[model samples]
Target: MTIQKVHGREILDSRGNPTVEVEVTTELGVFRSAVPSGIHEACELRDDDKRRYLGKGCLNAVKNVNDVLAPALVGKDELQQSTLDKLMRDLDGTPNKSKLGANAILGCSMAISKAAAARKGVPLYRYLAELAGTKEVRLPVPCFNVINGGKHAGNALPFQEFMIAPVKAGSFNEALRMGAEVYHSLKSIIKKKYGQDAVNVGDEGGFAPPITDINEPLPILMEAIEQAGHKGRFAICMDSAASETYDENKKQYNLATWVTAKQLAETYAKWVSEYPIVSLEDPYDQDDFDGFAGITEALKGKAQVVGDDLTVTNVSRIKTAIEKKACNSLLLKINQIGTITEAIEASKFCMSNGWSVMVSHRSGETEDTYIADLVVGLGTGQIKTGAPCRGERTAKLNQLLRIEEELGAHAKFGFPAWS
Candidate 1:
């Protein structure tokens, strides 16, 4: 199980942007994984040289992995994922992985994770479940983003994404079919109402129509669900990404128009009352703990208030949110915390606090389906990759489909009860 060699390279993500991919060769074989390109707490090293890839190149991260991280990890045992991840963290010796570059460190970490799983002669999810100390694993409910707005699209709607979850599906395969049917139905609806040009997809494969009103997409989504013959079988979800819409000077959120924290919470409550919205992510600005708490308190059983920008998968931030009662669920992003061990730790912490966990994917993604195993291993019971369209998004959902088939009669499909 000892690592024989480690290698890194700059690779193009699904969006044609550069990201890091790492390979770890052990006695068993070679295992590889790629890093998604979204970093907040930990800095993702980027070559800002205007000469290459518009300064978006990840060659520096790739070099760091090959020259720095690779040597440190060469003789380490792949099975000791936490120990290897800790060594990488200690080697960097910085608060947010600036020295080794989070992209470099995470790439190495994930590659090791895969290597360990292979060495153990078990599936990735099973290996991950062992690491998580989880005796039983459950497939997550895939939240399909069917509409794009806010920063993802040049539209009037300020919400980043509008999703539909097959909350009522009996199995993972059934849920996948339900989500894809709804996505196609929504595409047809957009094409019929706004012409063929409006059917173009956004970053996460969600449709970006020429929509103006915030209320417009909700009704359209509900109509799509009904049209797909899944009337009561789906639950709506939203990712406002409110930080982008937050006005620092005014201390208000702009859902196209400015509104106070209270007003925004009220609007969310109104929407929950009107729609089958089971979850709302980043409903308040990232910094607005009080606002998040208010909405969480108001929505309690009606919907789950999820923290993405609010927590950033940082343990300290998540702890603060938990103490303040900011949000009831976490959006787990591996790159946000910079390692496989830390991401699992963050999810374990959230679940310990009785908060639901939703494993997530970045906009600039790869065909890497590591998170598909992570979600199943952690048994988080929720994931939001994107719509059923793009390969990068469907790659994860398809992986889940395979995982369910692999597990056969042992597979369980359902969200953990909310506390």
Candidate 2:
């Protein structure tokens, strides 16, 4: 197939916010990808003292990805995946990590992946499977967002942060039951600790309450898993959302120091021992590579200590973490680095080194369905899209359904590297 024209758009999310999307149209068809905007929203560009050097309006990061990076590969070969990857990387001279402007670099890489998939005349997951040496992708059952920002942050208080599907009992119905048991048990603990009103049950359909005491929820969660009879079938993943906390001096930063990291790790380990937690993400701040490595060493083999902010999809950061043995897992977000190709390369690097990778989404999202396809296409089994309730979360599930429809039996995939 020959290279074709490239197209892009400014997608407006639920909140009327915009994220730039790029589509590569090849002779085979059209493949599309987007650069998400949440990274910029949650970023804190302050020094240790928490002085706000950069106002929260860092739109330049997003603008660079949509404007500068998108134009660099408008007419490149779509089928030459590796060559295209090199070209994308050449724009900033980095492989396996995001460049300085993450959004721009990520946007460019995403465009490349879509272009490559289009040239091959297959869905993104199929392309990824070829690379991953697998036929089926593992589906992660998400923890619903229950609470809104109040006495408790608007977060879900699930005992474990993530759950896996195909729960060896051999049926989705059984899996759902097991998931509910684990969810309810955690809910009970939340109610006991913070009183009934403190937990936002919000109809059966709303997001779950965010449990404040990480330590208190483990026993309840473990009991729920055991009660549900889901032994060895399901696994747990943690998302610390490290940005939620403030320092002793009442400052906010991404890095969790050794003290905080140790506490979080201890709490996480307690749950892992009680439940089947397999992965942990963003236990510390993005810049605290030293702390991350220490936590990784502490929890090695027992569970995967993952870096979300820690990795940030920057090759330099990832290399640095790898060298330091900072983490055993990496949570891949295309938008975090601003491109699909770079996200894939980062995943590749983690895989090559025997680390697990989980493709994820932002809290604020739109109708873009690229990440779902990327997770399946790239054979990344775990995804943290949140709740599977919101439109953004459903967008991903719908993509997975479409993949199942088109790929037929081949769509069944296992968790990459884990099972």
Candidate 3:
């Protein structure tokens, strides 16, 4: 089907921050998609006029889609996802898609893919599987962030996200049920120990308790898993977002205090010994490839050293990380690369290199459930879309439930073991 029209508008994300929403029309129907915000990713253009939404408004991006991108793509075949994505990239002519704004470019890129799926008269995931050439469509292990800290919360804990993965669950539905139970158990535990005030959740619906220690949440999380009667079926994951605490000038991390890369690596290894830590994201600064490689080697076979900031979903960066063995997994966020084709390519690249690809969501999200289909389509068996509380977060998880149901006996659920 040929694209008939492309329209974009400014909308608010989960954080109440402005974002871009694009609508692509084809003979079949209209498809919509929204862009998520991120750090250490491709640049997202924002109108710098503080007079509107504190300069967070994406009005310029909307115009870029409506006035610039839309006209150029009106007559293009919607099913040619890679060609359309390349046309947009070439038109933007920027390394990061800054000229057309990643928000603008991704908005259209996502919507077009959805439109193409609609035209194919199949579910989005099926269509995506066709595009990605993935033969097996496995339901992903949902990495739920049940405890929030760092930039996501007002809590004293410096680590960004503490997640739980129901890796041992029989199916996606069972995994989600286990995750929801553990989340509630953790909430009750937080309330009982820290009072009702500490029950207040952060942006991604993860409880933001008043605890200060980094190790504090792990024991509590263990308690929650056991209390929920899901022990041994669950594994722990953490997103230190080390770039946030990295002192660029000093070339050291400021977790509890200033610590060298080696010291931090040792700390992570110690934690892995203490807990069933399966995955660790952004454990070092984006530029600290050696640190990442060292940690990956030290924790080899014990845990997955993930690269979110270190790779940023770019092929060149992923290639470099592979050469240096910086990390064993890629945290695939579509907005990070600004196009679905590129995102799929990144996923394929990682998997081909024997690296896991964990589809992820940004802190500032929308009700877009695209990633749910994407993880399944890519057959990447791992997805991190926040906790199962907020509507924006649950949207993706719920979509997965429907997908699993649709697949019925055909559905496969499980993540790859650490390579």
lDDT of 1 by residue, 1-419 (tens): 48999999888999999999999998788788999975358888898989999999988899899998989988888999999999999999999999888999999988898988888889999999999987789998899888888887888988888899998888999999999899889999999999999988877888989898777889998999999999998898899999998888999877737889988877887899999999999998898999999899998888999999999999999999999999989999999889999999998899999899999999899999999999999988899888888999999999999999999977899685521
Question: How many collisions per candidate?
Answer: 0, 35, 0
lDDT of each: 0.90, 0.57, 0.90
Lowest lDDT sum, 10 consecutive residues, model 3, at 410-419
Q: Candidate 3: which stretches are off by over 4 Å? A: none
Residues 1-419 of candidate 2 have per-residue lDDT tens digits of 54555554546654455555556666666666665555322131112222322233334545554455556655666566666556655665644333424444554556666666656766677776665555556443333332333223454342224333323433223434555565565456657666777545332123244555445444444554665566566665666655445364543332233245556556556666776666767766666676678877777776788877777766677788889888877777666554444566678888888787777776557677877777776666566665435577667766766665676544444453345
Residue 359 lDDT, candidate 1, scale 0-100: 93
TM-score of 1: 0.98
What's the true lDDT of residue 258 in model 3?
89
